[PDB]
Symmetry: C2
Subunit: 129 residues, 2 copies
């Protein structure tokens, strides 16, 4: 570009119950969430979830999801590269969530598996072979 | 989590004609792009765009958009923090794109403006005060 730079560009996520979403992220994937703004009636308007600990987030980068109020995405909402996919699948499974696909190898050189959230969107995870 | 870390998490973006989308990101926002795989008819199935030069990406630290073939997103597709919001607006306008809202101040402490892409999605840009 010219005259400007991108500092952060984290993915967006939409929900009709921000607290439920945050809890799913924390209980099923082991992430940390935080509602940043609430409605006059106490409903979440804006927030976020990240895979690292709350601490690190309070002192800066951002690789989590921004949470906005609205109709949840229908289809793929995330495409994440990770380390420890096997561990991921076990963790999610141990936590009781069964809506996760088996792990499989992609033609482009990586093992993948995808998860459906409480809101119904698909999150795709992958690790290079 | 436990046993796994998120290495990268760039936002997803869907398009029916990747080349046109990539040209837009290049001509209007001054970004860079590359189509990694095409279909039997010549269209891109997978690719990406990023704010920095090609030199970085091939030399990993991925914060652009992953591009997949599909129906464009209706509504907000990006929420990114930037520096030089005035420069951005002028750059876009200077490059002939008129579907960019004016810059305005948000209650939460930042100036913002949204841009409509060639595909119809909305990209929100903000800079804190």
């Amino acid at each position: 570009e010219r005259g400007y730079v991108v500092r952060e560009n984290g993915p967006v996520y939409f929900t009709k119950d921000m607290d439920k979403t945050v809890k799913w992220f924390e209980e099923i994937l082991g992430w940390s969430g935080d509602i940043v703004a609430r409605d006059d009636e106490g409903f979440g308007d804006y927030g976020c979830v990240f895979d690292y600990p709350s601490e690190v987030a309070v002192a800066h980068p951002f690789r989590g999801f921004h949470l906005f109020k609205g109709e949840p995405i229908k289809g793929v909402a995330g495409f994440m590269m990770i380390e420890g996919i096997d561990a991921l699948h076990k963790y999610v499974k141990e936590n009781g969530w069964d809506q996760i696909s088996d792990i499989y190898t992609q033609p482009w050189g990586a093992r993948e598996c995808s998860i459906t959230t409480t809101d119904g969107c698909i999150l795709r995870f992958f690790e290079s072979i």
